[PDB]
Design a protein around this ligand. Structure first.
Ligand SMILES: CCCCCCCCCCCCCCCCCC(=O)OC[C@H](COP(=O)([O-])OCC(O)COP(=O)([O-])OC[C@@H](COC(=O)CCCCCCCCCCCCCCCCC)OC(=O)CCCCCCCCCCCCCCCCC)OC(=O)CCCCCCCCCCCCCCCCC
Ligand SMILES: CCCCCCCCCCCCCCCCCC(=O)OC[C@H](COP(=O)([O-])OCC(O)COP(=O)([O-])OC[C@@H](COC(=O)CCCCCCCCCCCCCCCCC)OC(=O)CCCCCCCCCCCCCCCCC)OC(=O)CCCCCCCCCCCCCCCCC
Ligand SMILES: CCCCCCCCCCCCCCCCCC(=O)OC[C@H](COP(=O)([O-])OCC(O)COP(=O)([O-])OC[C@@H](COC(=O)CCCCCCCCCCCCCCCCC)OC(=O)CCCCCCCCCCCCCCCCC)OC(=O)CCCCCCCCCCCCCCCCC
Ligand SMILES: CCCCCCCCCCCCCCCCCC(=O)OC[C@H](COP(=O)([O-])OCC(O)COP(=O)([O-])OC[C@@H](COC(=O)CCCCCCCCCCCCCCCCC)OC(=O)CCCCCCCCCCCCCCCCC)OC(=O)CCCCCCCCCCCCCCCCC
Ligand code: HEA
Ligand code: HEA
Ligand SMILES: CCCCCCCCCCCCCCCC(=O)O[C@H](COC(=O)CCCCCCC[C@@H](C)CCCCCCCCC)COP(=O)(O)O[C@H]1[C@H](O)[C@H](O)[C@@H](O)[C@@H](O)[C@@H]1O
Ligand SMILES: CCCCCCCCCCCCCC(=O)O[C@H](COC(=O)CCCCCCCCCCC)COP(=O)(O)O
Ligand SMILES: [Ca+2]
Ligand SMILES: [Cu+2]
Ligand SMILES: [Mg+2]
Lengths: 552, 86, 144, 88, 139, 66, 148, 184
């Protein structure tokens, strides 16, 4: 019964089978693989700017930069990292496993699914191409307060390209959001009821719903601003009450935006915990309600970004902001209960997902303090807030993203990433991050304001800047082993020839091959619970799963 | 067949595993033309630094591009020699 | 029949196997790069001679190493194929080919194809001998 | 001792500043407590609950606990309520 | 499809409550007026969910239980005929390029570029929509 | 000092590296060690064959000894 | 040649355009060569997929055991198992959409706003179909007589 | 026995397009608050004798659209093809009437850079007017496709979704008219 097999799998394709299949494709699996490659390419560009502005922040004198360059530099870092890396990388993970998770062969509209990626890429390019101009790119922050973006102040051409690129990106985002709702609602397998799908799918569905509300109101505001800058349209005049109109319009978008790039990465950790813990996810019904409550609450909390303005109803936005901190603790406790009383092995996915917990807790703790107007009266618009949103944001889209990559690399490629090369990366990242961002709280507390190009020698805060710069260079060098690992192990990696290399996988993507076929499936199991693949592989556990499920 | 398509039969007057239609036209450029071309292009990029310009940003751009070209050529040559590619 | 822990027969007749988190699936006793070197040699040799090449490493020795004739009946298209069987437990070298490579130079190829393997088998080298034998054999079989 | 707990705020020069400093220092303690009692929980299970040498069967497959989930949504609610009161 | 419909009206109820609360609480004891910017957004956020909820309710009451909506259904119940999906197309990238051209035209205020972009967009959309409907050539 | 800062920024990263690279990259992986011919062959039978050309009666043979 | 007009209308340095062109005139051709070569080979490989499997109709089947397949339309004779017999390349274009093969009739004989009597439509459809048969048959007969 | 996914796709998209107009409504209500007396300033004067008939034509367009949809469900390709042409003509009438009102208003001193009221008026009514032209393009694009192949259920689905879009358009206009010409 000997079977003939090759000594080693094929490394690469036969001199051209990708170039034409890159421009005509409608495969969701292919589009996802070409959705992160570009995201990680933009990550480096966004981070190089941070390295520049961190190097020109360690000594009191202006050594090699100017004011204008520094302004453009932090503005473009801020925009590229948020809108050209994170918001997109959300949708990369969607059309990579969601059809596999629901048991569908395809997305609802494939030929529309293709358009979103190209809109993303070209919008991003138009926005970034502001550096070719003799003037430079946008130099007014990602927030874009008015009147500073009026024809009078910031009359350059970089700002115009910024405005007109964000709109083209936002159209792709909306069109991508339209597709996932349809796919979830009307593409499911028989027996896959709404309350039987995994957590990731719920998160993506609610995220899409949130996108549909957040983005159009931003595009409208951008059109309004372009009207002022090109026609002299008297929309955001200070005399006309437009200084606060624009801020309301922007912050109706801004905070739902930061909750667009949070829940999907909650889903990833919620999918990773049960696999490596050899135990079911503790609380399935309640996590859905937590997601729904967090999403619903994050619409009526938008003026907590506007405290120093002294022009908002303070009680309204403080109480609700306190309330949006309740279900997050529920999620934390559910994760802890999931990883409670089970065999844990701590491979790379679990290590990253645990780093996520440790970082995000302090991020959220700092975030709650900002919600009280008395404390934000002293803290706002200083490096304390920068310390805050570089923990709550660095856990979801860095640690959880890497966890997802290490988790789903074999399922998408058929190779295993190295282990001795994936732990050095994690430890470098962790040490570098805590070295560079911990002292920013103190900096903001002593009275160092944000968006300052330089400072005076007799200011007190000099050594903390040196520590931050050292940590930032460690965090910048940390990424070499990861890229090396991906480059090396894509074609010379260890071959996985099973249906699941992680053993106790629960979702339906582990009930197929590595990688899956063109239409994702050659068979389907019988859908009974939220762990179909586990019951496929372990039929002797059904009686032990439905009897031990409840603790009293 | 109930289809409209008409099959064509034709007879006019590197192997087929790499280039499927290898016997229908010119489908091989010898290696060594491309390596020497790359090196010569790098030399030209390097030599254009002699002129009347007074800036130095352009010089660094030229150096970077030449370095990239040389690195690509070197990598290809090394891998071809060592036996990992054909 | 027999299914390991984590394996299950599906509705299509295909199996779904499982491996432990920190474990592999293939676990050959040879380095990866050596496997690559053997594989591409086996691939380009086979393509040139238009005859499938195979390698066997296992206990074929029962009756003067004559079950190789039965192992050759497992490769795809057994008629147009060549085999090389090696027994390290018994120091046995065997070559057997199907009835389509006749008259293409394989008659004059096996005698030195086995010598090439044996020459390197006089050292502690095993994976080197297979590639050497394949290289010396595939360069003497005419495509027709 | 208050220096290492105010994370480097300046001391006030007006009564309102002193009252704000009092509120802030009182809140930092209330946030380190809930951080410690969760870091401890994460550390506890990451050092004791592991795959031991003795390869036993899969552990207890429990996934629901209604009383603990019900008594857990109420405990932070009181904390945020008191914080809201003091904030006001 | 009752779960889908219920998930939307839950959000509708919450959004309506939030909008009504916000509108009144700003009319009384809040400087200025009603804070028209925030009130406007929340009364249309509710409408967003209301439209979808109503549509889903109608669809759910029209059609009966599907294989997806049945707790204990078999795989063999779903066997049949899915529908149509596009295997491949190179038109999306052309649409994106056309829109990019129009956007670059609008950014630098070059009306000729804007006009060219609009023409390109129309042509590309025409190409996309008519792809699987063109008949054979008449000769 | 303009001497300590420049040396420290570019010095610490390269020292933290190559100390974390000595305690991770200097251990044995899951790839099994190479088989020597001085020991009995203990492994399942191996049958390798090419996939070219793509898509019973046997009339030859040879032998050797080592 | 028009680097002074591009530098005015589009906001870019006039000094920068010269260097862009100077560096480009040695770099861009090489990139174009590589991309063109790969693209041509990929278009070749696109033709070998349809001669072997057939035209993808864009329809998914969902078999009883829960398998997803796509229906293919063979361009020639079929095997006893239903898989098409492979065809040879003859340097000629191949169809890739089912609508170009006649998977779609005329909406109906008539004006843009009013239809014609049914009999006319039936007769015209019959004539057109028969004419298509005759043309194809003539070409096939000529091609068969040539290669004897 | 299944939901129409091309129908659900259009409805979900139409929900998001309603939040686009939220911005414009917010701008209008914000600029209205800082009126400083009479909200329509001295130079401007709205003429109800031209905005009413055009609104009535736009309202009547929906009836013809629905008649076309009803004809589409039966298989009448000519019935579908007949109502959509008159719908297109009425939409074109709407656009030309709106343009005429614009020309009249500009000559009397109400412009975009002239005032804040001009700004909000033109922005709100010009973003709406773009959608109507898009709808007309959709009509012509769909009517061209009904001649390419035989009339199948997919064609009916396309007609229905286009009708959905048109209905949304005129419902938005009714709101705009009520909030601009009456609630001044
Ligand atoms: C302006 C820019 C210049 C304009 C020219 C555009 C064309 C570029 C040249 C090109 O495509 O041909 C190269 C070459 C041609 O391929 P081929 O001729 O089919 O070769 C057959 C292969 O041997 C057989 O390939 P294979 O599939 O068997 O093996 C490939 C495998 C093997 O992987 C590797 O070898 C390693 C990959 C690198 C490591 C990744 C780094 C870490 C990133 C983290 C990712 C996390 C996950 O990896 C993949 O599957 C590749 C996926 C990558 C997707 C590319 C995303 C970019 C799309 C946008 C451009 C359009 O490869 C490519 O097509 C890749 C494109 C290179 C990316 C450059 C960026 C282009 C930017 C375009 C801007 C917009 C203008 C339009
Ligand atoms: C803004 C974007 C609006 C797109 C909304 C689409 C969402 C619905 C999803 C859907 O059904 O997708 C169908 C389909 C997706 O393709 P697939 O993946 O093969 O889906 C298979 C379907 O099941 C196969 O479905 P089918 O073949 O039966 O075709 C049904 C489809 C198409 O049926 C038609 O024939 C409808 C006409 C096509 C759309 C015309 C838009 C022209 C835009 C240019 C405006 C002039 C300036 O029906 C619709 O899409 C109904 C929507 C009504 C269209 C009205 C839009 C007016 C634009 C407003 C301008 C402001 O998409 C289309 O055919 C049209 C999508 C348009 C994308 C263009 C995006 C760029 C727009 C930039 C304009 C900037 C102007 C300056
Ligand atoms: C600015 C750029 C300036 C360059 C312009 C042309 C001057 C160079 C001309 C020359 O002498 O070429 C030398 C040499 C001459 O030999 P050849 O003509 O290629 O001979 C055919 C070979 O047998 C063909 O054999 P082969 O291509 O199979 O060789 C093996 C190897 C060739 O290796 C490479 O070409 C480099 C691959 C390694 C670096 C990329 C990975 C990312 C970095 C990770 C860090 C690694 C450490 O292929 C790969 O492993 C490439 C991976 C393809 C999968 C697609 C994934 C791409 C994702 C992109 C990531 C972002 O050509 C090359 O080295 C190939 C590239 C051709 C140069 C032009 C096209 C470059 C692609 C577009 C870049 C422009 C960006 C905008
Ligand atoms: C601001 C800058 C722009 C200014 C531009 C100024 C120049 C204007 C160009 C005028 C075009 C001249 C066309 C002459 C023929 C017209 C007579 C006619 O009805 O021919 C029927 C003819 C079908 O002939 P056939 O040989 O039986 O083809 C049937 C096959 O099944 C077909 O086989 P297939 O499946 O391969 O066909 C695919 C292809 C078939 O269409 C084409 O072949 C289009 C030809 C364009 C080629 C341009 C070269 C591009 C090089 C790159 O369809 C498409 O891809 C759709 C194209 C978009 C439709 C046009 C919409 C224009 C909107 C304008 C806004 O279809 C067309 O050519 C219709 C498109 C032309 C639109 C007519 C508008 C007239 C007024 C001109 C504008 C002023
Ligand atoms: C996902 C979101 C995200 C991520 C990941 C980061 C990542 C980092 N950020 Fe953050 N940042 C923001 C979101 C993010 N940031 C936002 C929203 C602002 C607001 C500012 C504003 O108002 O505009 C901000 C602003 C901000 C500031 C405040 C600046 C100021 O206000 O003056 C600082 C301070 O140091 C900072 C530092 C960093 C550092 C050191 C990293 C490190 O993570 C990154 C280091 C990584 C790299 C450097 C990659 C390495 C690159 C290479 C090794 C070379 C490769 C070369 C090529 C490809 C050509 N960023
Ligand atoms: C990116 C992701 C992200 C996430 C998830 C959040 C989450 C939160 N954010 Fe936001 N925020 C940003 C991104 C994010 N934020 C960004 C980018 C900015 C700056 C934009 C700019 O101005 O440039 C910002 C700014 C910002 C401000 C304005 C600050 C200022 O400008 O001065 C405020 C104020 O209310 C705020 C509050 C919160 C709160 C209360 C949460 C809550 O979601 C977090 C709650 C988490 C926890 C509570 C921890 C877990 C809970 C438990 C373990 C139970 C414990 C119970 C109690 C303590 C009672 N953040
Ligand atoms: C046709 C495509 C060709 C493809 C080939 C690509 C090759 C690109 C090579 C890169 C060119 C580098 C140009 C450098 C040569 C140079 O001189 O550049 C300087 C300023 O560097 C810059 O900006 C660098 C700009 C980089 C441009 C990158 C080009 C990529 C674009 C062109 C690709 C997009 C293609 C178009 C897309 C359209 C189709 C879409 C697909 C200007 O000097 P200057 O201005 O005098 O600076 C003075 C100080 O010195 C002094 O202190 C003082 O401060 C002042 O006196 C100051 O003036
Ligand atoms: C992505 C593609 C976007 C392209 C948009 C094209 C729109 C450009 C139209 C230019 C209008 C100039 C009219 C003007 O200033 O004349 C003024 C009067 O304009 C009007 O009242 C008619 C304007 C038509 C309404 C259209 C609104 C659309 C809003 C678009 C916001 C960007 C006269 O200015 P003046 O007093 O002479 O200084
Ligand atoms: Ca400095
Ligand atoms: Cu906020
Ligand atoms: Mg501020």
């Amino acid at each position: 019964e000997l079977e003939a097999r090759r000594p080693f799998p094929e490394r690469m394709g036969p001199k051209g089978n990708l170039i034409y299949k890159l421009i005509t494709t409608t495969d969701h699996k292919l589009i996802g693989i070409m959705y992160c490659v570009v995201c990680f390419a933009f990550f480096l560009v966004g981070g190089l700017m941070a390295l520049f502005m961190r190097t020109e922040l360690a000594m009191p004198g202006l050594q090699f930069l100017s004011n204008e360059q520094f302004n453009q530099l932090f503005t473009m870092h801020g925009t590229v990292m948020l809108l050209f890396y994170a918001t997109p990388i959300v949708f990369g993970f969607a059309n990579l496993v969601l059809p596999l998770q629901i048991g569908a062969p395809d997305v609802a509209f494939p030929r529309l699914n293709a358009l979103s990626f190209w809109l993303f890429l070209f919008g991003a390019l138009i926005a970034i191409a502001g550096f070719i101009t003799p003037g430079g790119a946008a130099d007014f922050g990602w927030t874009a307060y008015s009147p500073l973006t009026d024809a009078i102040h910031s009359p350059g051409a970089g700002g115009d390209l910024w405005i007109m690129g964000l709109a083209v990106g936002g159209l792709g985002t909306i069109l991508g959001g339209v597709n996932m709702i349809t796919t979830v609602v009307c593409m499911r397998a028989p027996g896959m009821t709404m309350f039987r799908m995994p957590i990731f799918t719920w998160n993506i569905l609610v995220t899409s719903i949130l996108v549909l509300i957040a983005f159009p109101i931003l595009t409208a505001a951008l059109f309004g601003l372009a009207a002022d800058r090109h026609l002299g349209a008297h929309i955001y005049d200070p005399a006309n009450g437009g200084v606060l109109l624009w801020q309301h319009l922007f912050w109706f978008f801004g905070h739902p935006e930061v909750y667009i790039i949070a829940l999907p990465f909650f889903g990833i950790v919620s999918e990773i915990f049960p696999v490596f813990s050899r135990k079911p996810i503790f609380g399935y019904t309640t996590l859905i309600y937590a997601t729904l409550a967090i999403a619903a609450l994050s619409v009526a909390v938008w003026a907590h970004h506007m405290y120093a303005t002294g022009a908002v109803l303070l009680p309204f936005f403080s109480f609700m902001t306190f309330l949006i901190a309740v279900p997050t603790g529920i999620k934390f406790f559910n994760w802890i209960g999931t990883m409670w009383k089970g065999q844990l092995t701590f491979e790379t996915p679990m290590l990253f997902s645990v780093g996520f917990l440790i970082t995000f807790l302090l991020g959220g703790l700092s975030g709650v303090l900002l919600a009280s107007p008395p404390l934000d009266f002293h803290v706002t618009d200083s490096y304390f807030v920068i310390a805050h949103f570089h923990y709550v944001l660095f856990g979801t889209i860095v640690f959880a993203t890497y966890a997802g990559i290490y988790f789903w690399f074999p399922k998408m490629t058929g190779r295993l990433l190295d282990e001795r090369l994936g732990k050095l990366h994690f430890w470098l990242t962790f040490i570098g991050f805590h070295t560079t961002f911990l002292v920013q709280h103190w900096l903001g507390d002593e009275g160092m304001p944000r968006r300052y190009a330089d400072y005076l020698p007799t200011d007190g805060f000099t050594t903390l800047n040196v520590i931050s710069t050292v940590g930032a260079f460690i965090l910048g060098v940390s990424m070499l082993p990861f890229v090396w690992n991906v480059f090396k192990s894509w074609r010379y990696g260890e071959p996985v020839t099973v249906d699941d290399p992680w053993g106790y996988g629960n979702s339906l993507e582990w009930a197929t091959s590595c990688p899956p076929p063109r239409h994702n499936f050659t068979e389907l199991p019988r859908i009974r619970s939220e762990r179909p693949a586990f019951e496929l592989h372990y039929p002797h556990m059904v009686e032990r799963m439905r009897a031990e499920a409840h603790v009293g | 067949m109930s289809s409209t398509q008409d099959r064509s039969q034709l007879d006019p007057e590197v192997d087929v595993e790499d280039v499927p239609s290898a016997e229908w036209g010119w489908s091989h450029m010898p290696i060594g033309v491309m390596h020497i071309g790359g090196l010569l292009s790098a030399a030209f990029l390097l030599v254009m630094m002699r002129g009347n310009h007074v800036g130095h940003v352009e010089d660094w751009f030229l150096i970077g591009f030449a370095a990239v070209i040389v690195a690509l050529v070197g990598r290809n040559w090394w891998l071809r020699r060592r036996g990992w590619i054909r | 029949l027999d299914l390991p822990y984590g394996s299950a027969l599906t509705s299509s007749g295909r199996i779904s196997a499982v491996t432990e988190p920190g474990e592999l699936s293939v676990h050959y006793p040879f380095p990866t790069m050596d496997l690559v070197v053997l594989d591409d040699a086996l691939k380009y040799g086979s393509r040139a001679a238009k005859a499938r090449f195979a390698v066997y490493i296992g206990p074929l020795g029962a009756d003067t190493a004559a079950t190789a004739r039965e192992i050759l009946a497992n490769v795809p298209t057994p008629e147009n194929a060549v085999l090389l069987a090696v027994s390290p437990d018994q120091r046995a070298i065997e070559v057997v080919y199907g009835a389509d490579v006749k008259g293409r130079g394989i008659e004059s190829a096996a005698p030195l194809g086995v010598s090439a393997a044996a020459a390197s088998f006089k050292e502690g080298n095993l994976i080197d001998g297979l590639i050497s034998a394949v290289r010396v054999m595939s360069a003497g079989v005419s495509p027709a | 001792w208050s220096d290492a707990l105010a994370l480097g705020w300046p001391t006030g020069i007006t009564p309102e500043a002193k009252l704000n400093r009092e509120l802030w220092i009182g809140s930092v303690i209330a946030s380190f407590a809930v951080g410690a009692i969760v870091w401890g929980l994460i550390f506890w299970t990451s050092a004791f609950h592991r795959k031991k040498a003795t390869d036993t069967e899969l552990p207890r497959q429990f996934g629901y606990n209604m009383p603990l989930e019900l008594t857990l949504t109420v405990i932070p609610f009181l904390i945020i309520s008191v914080l809201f009161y003091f904030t006001v | 499809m009752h779960i889908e419909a219920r998930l939307f009206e839950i959000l509708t109820a919450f959004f309506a409550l939030a909008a009504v609360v916000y509108a009144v609480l700003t009319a009384m004891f809040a400087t200025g007026g009603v804070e028209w910017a925030g009130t406007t957004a929340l009364v249309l956020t509710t409408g967003l969910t209301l439209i979808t909820g109503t549509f889903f309710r109608f669809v759910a009451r029209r059609l009966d239980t599907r294989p997806e909506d049945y707790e204990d259904a078999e795989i063999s119940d779903g066997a049949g005929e899915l529908g149509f999906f596009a295997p491949h197309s190179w038109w999306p990238i052309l649409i994106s390029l056309s829109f990019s051209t129009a956007a670059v035209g609008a950014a630098l205020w070059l009306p000729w570029l804007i006009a060219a972009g609009v023409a390109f967009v129309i042509t590309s959309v025409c190409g996309l929509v008519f792809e699987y409907y063109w008949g054979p050539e008449k000769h | 000092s303009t001497a300590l800062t420049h040396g420290l920024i570019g010095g610490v990263p390269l020292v933290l590296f190559a100390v974390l690279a000595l305690i991770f990259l200097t251990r044995k992986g899951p790839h099994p060690d190479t088989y020597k011919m001085s020991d009995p062959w203990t492994h399942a039978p191996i049958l390798w064959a090419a996939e070219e050309p793509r898509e019973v009666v046997i009339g030859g043979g040879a032998s050797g000894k080592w | 040649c028009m680097n002074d007009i591009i530098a005015l209308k589009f906001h870019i340095s006039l000094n920068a355009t010269t260097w862009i062109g100077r560096i480009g005139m040695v770099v861009l051709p090489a990139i174009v060569y590589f991309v063109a070569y790969r693209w041509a080979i990929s278009l070749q490989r696109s033709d070998r997929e349809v001669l072997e499997h057939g035209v993808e109709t864009g329809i998914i089947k969902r078999l009883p055991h829960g398998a997803y397949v796509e229906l293919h339309q063979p361009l020639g004779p079929v095997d006893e198992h239903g898989h098409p017999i492979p065809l040879e390349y003859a340097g000629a274009p191949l169809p890739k959409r089912m609508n170009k093969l006649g998977s779609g009739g005329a909406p109906g004989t008539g004006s843009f706003l009013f239809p014609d009597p049914a009999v006319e439509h039936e007769a015209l459809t019959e004539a057109a179909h028969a004419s298509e048969h005759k043309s194809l048959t003539a070409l096939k007969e000529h091609q068969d007589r040539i290669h004897g | 026995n299944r939901p129409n996914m091309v129908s659900v796709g259009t409805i979900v998209w139409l929900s998001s397009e309603l939040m686009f107009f939220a911005g414009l409504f917010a701008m209008y209500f914000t600029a209205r608050a800082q009126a400083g007396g009479a909200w329509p300033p001295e130079p401007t004067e709205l003429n109800l004798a031209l905005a009413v008939p055009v609104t009535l034509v736009l309202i009547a367009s929906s009836f013809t659209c629905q008649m076309g949809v009803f004809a589409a469900e039966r298989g009448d390709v000519f019935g579908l093809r007949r109502w959509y042409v008159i719908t297109f003509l009425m939409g074109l009438f709407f656009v030309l009437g709106q343009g005429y009102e614009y020309i009249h208003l500009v000559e009397h001193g109400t412009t975009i850079p002239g005032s804040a009221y001009g700004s909000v008026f033109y922005l709100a009514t010009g973003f709406h007017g773009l959608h109507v032209i898009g709808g007309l393009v959709a009509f012509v694009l769909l009517l061209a496709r009904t001649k390419m192949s035989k009339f199948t259920p997919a064609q009916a689905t396309a007609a229905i979704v286009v009708s959905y879009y048109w209905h949304f358009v005129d419902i938005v206009w009714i709101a705009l008219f009520a909030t601009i010409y009456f609630v001044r």
